């Protein structure tokens, strides 16, 4: 069934996911200066002190880093969102080659990766519940730019040996998230979907200007992982985006001047 590859790509995913071609879907190209400065839009409040991270998983599309959402430990609220959202987990999408790999594009630009931390709304008391809501989800979309090391990132990417093929998973406690972040919170946000089947149309988007910086020696790891399971042919796990979709009937909002 459904992957990256020429035969079961983003172009084939409408045939078992109709919604692909829906109203609302993921990604999108950010024009930043079609989105509008919303004045009453709200800081975000990012509270990741308590997060516990538990495990790292290679699902066979990207790898996983997953939290306890069994308490609200690590949550995302203001912005755009009313209410609570947990964070479950994280992920990153990235390219065989550093100019390309992002879902999102700013003025279609292209950057080398794009992490996406997942967060559920707690009204809707388990994540399966709330994929099925139009806000169910937030996930709040990092770029990552190749150029300096990101030294919260490394004790990700040293892992990845351990977790090399699809089903694999590996221990990963006592990660913290904040390290991930860039300086600014400053955001665009628009109404969107899950950037993988099942294309739920139930995330509100949250993308921060401020890209991070990783290393080559970084995103070169990611590249190393394989789609495929162990004892099966070597499939190099890289570019696992989808690229933009139509905008449709939304508007970009920024958070910022
Ligand atoms: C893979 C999956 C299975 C069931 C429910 C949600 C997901 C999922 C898909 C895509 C994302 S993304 N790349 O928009 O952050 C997150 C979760
Ligand atoms: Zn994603």
Request: glycine share 8%; proline share 7%.
């Given at each position: 069934?459904?992957?990256?590859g020429?035969?079961?790509?983003?172009?084939?995913?409408?045939?078992?996911?109709?919604?692909?071609?829906?109203?609302?879907?993921?990604?999108?190209?950010?024009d930043?200066?079609?989105?509008?400065?919303?004045?009453?839009?709200?800081?975000?409040?990012?509270?990741?002190?308590?997060?516990?991270?538990?495990?790292?998983?290679?699902?066979?599309?990207?790898?996983?880093?997953?939290?306890?959402?069994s308490?609200?430990?690590?949550?995302?609220?203001?912005?755009?969102?009313?209410?609570?959202?947990?964070?479950?987990?994280?992920?990153?999408?990235?390219?065989?080659?550093?100019?390309?790999?992002?879902?999102?594009?700013?003025?279609?630009?292209?950057?080398?990766?794009?992490?996406?931390?997942?967060?559920?709304?707690?009204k809707?008391?388990?994540?399966?519940?709330?994929?099925?809501?139009?806000?169910?989800?937030?996930?709040?979309?990092?770029?990552?730019?190749?150029?300096?090391?990101?030294?919260?990132?490394?004790?990700?990417?040293?892992?990845?040996?351990?977790?090399?093929?699809?089903?694999?998973?590996?221990?990963?406690?006592?990660?913290?998230?904040?390290?991930?972040?860039?300086?600014?919170?400053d955001?665009?946000?628009?109404?969107?979907?899950?950037?993988?089947?099942?294309?739920?149309?139930?995330?509100?988007?949250?993308?921060?200007?401020?890209?991070?910086?990783?290393?080559?020696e970084?995103?070169?790891?990611?590249?190393?992982?394989?789609?495929?399971?162990?004892?099966?042919?070597?499939?190099?796990?890289?570019?696992?985006?989808?690229?933009?979709?139509?905008?449709?009937?939304?508007?970009?909002?920024?958070?910022?001047?």
């Amino acid at each position: 069934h459904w992957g990256y590859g020429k035969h079961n790509g983003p172009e084939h995913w409408h045939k078992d996911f109709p919604i692909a071609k829906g109203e609302r879907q993921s990604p999108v190209d950010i024009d930043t200066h079609t989105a509008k400065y919303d004045p009453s839009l709200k800081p975000l409040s990012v509270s990741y002190d308590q997060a516990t991270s538990l495990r790292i998983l290679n699902n066979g599309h990207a790898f996983n880093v997953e939290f306890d959402d069994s308490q609200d430990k690590a949550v995302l609220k203001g912005g755009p969102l009313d209410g609570t959202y947990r964070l479950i987990q994280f992920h990153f999408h990235w390219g065989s080659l550093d100019g390309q790999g992002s879902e999102h594009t700013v003025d279609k630009k292209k950057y080398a990766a794009e992490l996406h931390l997942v967060h559920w709304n707690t009204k809707y008391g388990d994540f399966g519940k709330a994929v099925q809501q139009p806000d169910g989800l937030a996930v709040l979309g990092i770029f990552l730019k190749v150029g300096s090391a990101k030294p919260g990132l490394q004790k990700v990417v040293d892992v990845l040996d351990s977790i090399k093929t699809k089903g694999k998973s590996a221990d990963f406690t006592n990660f913290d998230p904040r390290g991930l972040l860039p300086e600014s919170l400053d955001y665009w946000t628009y109404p969107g979907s899950l950037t993988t089947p099942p294309l739920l149309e139930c995330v509100t988007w949250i993308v921060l200007k401020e890209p991070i910086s990783v290393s080559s020696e970084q995103v070169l790891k990611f590249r190393k992982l394989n789609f495929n399971g162990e004892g099966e042919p070597e499939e190099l796990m890289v570019d696992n985006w989808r690229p933009a979709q139509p905008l449709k009937n939304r508007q970009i909002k920024a958070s910022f001047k």
